[PDB]
UniProtKB/Swiss-Prot annotation, chain B:
This is Spike protein S1. Attaches the virion to the cell membrane by interacting with host receptor, initiating the infection. The major receptor is host ACE2. When S2/S2' has been cleaved, binding to the receptor triggers direct fusion at the cell membrane. When S2/S2' has not been cleaved, binding to the receptor results in internalization of the virus by endocytosis using host TFRC and GRM2 and leading to fusion of the virion membrane with the host endosomal membrane. Alternatively, may use NRP1/NRP2 and integrin as entry receptors. Residues 5-27 are annotated as: Disordered. The gene is S. Binds to host ACE2. RBD also interacts with the N-linked glycan on 'Asn-90' of ACE2. Cleavage of S generates a polybasic C-terminal sequence on S1 that binds to host Neuropilin-1 (NRP1) and Neuropilin-2 (NRP2) receptors. Interacts with host integrin alpha-5/beta-1 (ITGA5:ITGB1) and with ACE2 in complex with integrin alpha-5/beta-1 (ITGA5:ITGB1). May interact via cytoplasmic c-terminus with M protein. May interact (via N-terminus) with host bilirubin and biliverdin, thereby preventing antibody binding to the SARS-CoV-2 spike NTD via an allosteric mechanism. It comes from Severe acute respiratory syndrome coronavirus 2 (2019-nCoV).
Length: 50, 49
């Protein structure tokens, strides 16, 4: 039994149109960077958060 | 005819023309009113969307 919480997720749609991967933007600082850049490949450098 | 805050389940039938494609005319599908050519495609969606 689990309760859903209003978080932030970035769904990944492939060529079939189904959800294959989901990354939560409220857990680790590394996952929060992919929320603004809208990409799962973060290169080197300094970025912002909030 | 009682109308309260509950969601209504008894509405009325909607009667309209058939389907005319290959023309740049106005169309309407489930409220989405657009204007363009209803050309065919090869992709497929999902059986619940």
């Amino acid at each position: 039994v689990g309760y859903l919480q209003p978080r932030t997720f970035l769904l990944k749609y492939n060529e079939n149109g189904t959800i294959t991967d989901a990354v939560d933007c409220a857990l680790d600082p590394l996952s929060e960077t992919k929320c603004t850049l809208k990409s799962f490949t973060v290169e080197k450098g300094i970025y912002q958060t909030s | 005819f009682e109308l309260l805050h509950a969601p209504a389940t008894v509405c009325g039938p909607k009667k309209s023309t058939n389907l005319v494609k290959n023309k740049c005319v106005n169309f309407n599908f489930n409220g989405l009113t657009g204007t363009g050519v209803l050309t065919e495609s090869n992709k497929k969606f999902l059986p619940f969307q």
